[PDB]
Structure 1
């Protein structure tokens, strides 16, 4: 069994910026979710080999996780807040697509997503 390579976190070809919205995504959004009791399954790529989920990357063709998002924010990968918000939504959607209502992982994702929605509702206007 084999995991795919992780998503890209560095790419000198990619355009990027620092902005106040991206700062908020790191300081407020990511750090709020990261510290939550239910964060840990989402803090790194799904290890389908050790978890014995051999169909994971058959179903999930755009993997995403908060470890990747953390690296992207720390490494100034993004051009805008949309790109980062999309990564969070990909992560949640993957979980919902792969699993079933009521699964522990789905309940965990929902708790994180609740907080995500609350924080992104107060994303500041661009400076």
Structure 2
């Protein structure tokens, strides 16, 4: 992957804010559907995603574009709304985190640029 202004902002502003939120802990690691007794979880949710995975990907420069990172966040939230019950607090926790995510994306640099300056050689 690579480092862009938007990806660096996602890592050290957006993820920084979301990871330490009071509601973050259910989303810091993948759903353990075996331990939690949810053997329909992976039947219903085709793309599991969590902030621990996203954070590791940001740390390892896995993403090529901010859009891929934003789609992982988006999928994480949507998974929660699709699987759980409308009245579960976990849904309201996801909704709270997603509102912060959106507000941070609003303030992200507008145009993605790779963080690179090269001296012409050859």
The TM-score, its normalising length taken from structure 1, stands at 0.86
Match of 2:12 among 15, 21, 27: 27
Displacement of 1:102: 2.1
Mark the runs of 5 or more structure 1 residues left unpaired by the alignment. Answer: 1-15
Which residue pairs with 1:80 in the alignment? 65
Displacement of 1:20: 1.0
Mark the runs of 5 or more structure 2 residues left unpaired by the alignment. Answer: 114-122
**Number of residues paired by the alignment?**
112
The whole-number CA distance in structure 2 between the counterparts of 1:102 and 1:75 is: 37
Match of 2:103 among 103, 114, 118: 118
Find runs of 4+ consecutive structure 1 residues off by over 2 angstroms. none
The aligned runs of 1:11-26 (5 Å cut-off) are 16-26=1-11
The aligned runs of 1:27-106 (5 Å cut-off) are 27-106=12-91
What CA RMSD, in Å, does the superposition of the two structures yield over aligned residues?
Answer: 0.8
The whole-number CA distance in structure 1 between the counterparts of 2:22 and 2:75 is: 21
Which residue pairs with 1:9 in the alignment? none
The TM-score, its normalising length taken from structure 2, stands at 0.89
Larger radius of gyration: 2
